Design a protein around this ligand. Structure first.
Ligand SMILES: O=N[O-]
Length: 129
């Protein structure tokens, strides 16, 4: 499913991401835009053999099992295909564990390079929240 900007913002708020670990809703919307273009079916292979999955591009090196990343971890205890659902519950719950892991949102390269230090509030502008 390809989410609209305000539709995603509302689902993320519903799921409790707004100000989670001090990151405002705009940060998560900005990250999702640049990681997956709001597409739940997004997948990208990494140079090391692992793969990023879903709207928040969660990677199989640590977080999920995709049956093809030998010697990796499954810290969110899920198949990576669960991250590709039209329902973002599994992605949001895994994102909460990632952001709590010590490095905050710097875990997302696209956030660090494209969202961090910018006016992220612009991403929830005009939305009925
Ligand atoms: O993602 N472990 O194959």
């Amino acid at each position: 499913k390809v989410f609209g900007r305000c539709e995603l913002a509302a689902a993320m708020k519903r799921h409790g991401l707004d100000n989670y670990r001090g990151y405002s809703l705009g940060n998560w919307v900005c990250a999702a835009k640049f990681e997956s273009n709001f597409n739940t079916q997004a997948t990208n292979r990494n140079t090391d053999g692992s793969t990023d999955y879903g709207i928040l591009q969660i990677n199989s090196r640590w977080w999920c099992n995709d049956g093809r990343t030998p010697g990796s971890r499954n810290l969110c205890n899920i198949p990576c295909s669960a991250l590709l659902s039209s329902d973002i519950t599994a992605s949001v719950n895994c994102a909460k564990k990632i952001v709590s892991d010590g490095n905050g949102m710097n875990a997302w390269v696209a956030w660090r390079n494209r969202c961090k230090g910018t006016d992220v509030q612009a991403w929830i502008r005009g939305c009925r929240l």
